[PDB]
Amino acid sequence: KVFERCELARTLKRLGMDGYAGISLANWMCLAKWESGYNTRATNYNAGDRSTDYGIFQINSRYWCNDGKTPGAVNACHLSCSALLQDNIADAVACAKRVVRDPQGIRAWVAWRNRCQNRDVRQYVQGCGV
Q1: Is 35 one of the catalytic residues?
Q2: Do 62 and 51 form a contact (C-beta atoms < 8 A)?
Q3: Where is the active site?
Q4: What string of DSSP letters covers the chain?
Q5: Which residue in 52, 29, 28 sits closest to 42, CA to CA?
Q6: Catalytic residue among 7, 53, 67, 102, which?
Q7: Is 53 noted as a catalytic residue in this protein?
């Protein structure tokens, strides 16, 4: 599913993402936008390390979910990577929360550092009623 901007903003708010671990909804929106364009079935294979990024937040198989084909990978979110390709984002959100409970917080995603950190992210939630 490819979410529309405000549709996603309200979906994330209902899932408890607003201010989760000090991260605003606008930041989560900026992350999803740059990671997948709000597409829950986005996938990106990394030929270099044989891992794959899954879903709306492009969560990596080496550490977060199990896809059975990433060498020596772990599964910290304890989900099959398929759970991160569902139209319903509840599981992807639970896993994103788990990701940020790590040392780096929202900085875990390099794209957030590239396109969201120290940027004006207000635009992502403007007019969404969140």
Answers
A1: yes
A2: yes
A3: 35, 53
A4: -B--HHHHHHHHHHTT-TTBTTB-HHHHHHHHHHHHSSBTT-EEEETTTTEEEETTTTEETTTTSB-S-STT---TT-SBGGGGGSSS-HHHHHHHHHHHTSTTGGGGSHHHHHHTTTS--GGGTTTS--
A5: 52
A6: 53
A7: yes
Find the catalytic residue in 4, 7, 18, 35. Answer: 35
Q: Which amino acid is at 79?
A: L
Resolution (A): 1.8
Listed by start position, the domains of the chain span: 1-130
d(CA 104, CA 2): 28
Rg (CA), the chain: 14
Is the Cβ–Cβ distance between 95 and 59 less than 8 Å?
yes
Question: Is residue 105 within 8 Å of residue 22, measured between CB atoms?
Answer: yes
User: What is the experimental method?
Assistant: X-ray
In this structure, what token pair is assigned to residue 87?
Answer: 């139209």
Q: Which amino acid does the sequence have at 103?
A: P
Residue with tokens 């080496």: 62
Looking at the domain that runs over 1-130, which CATH code has it been given? 1.10.530.10
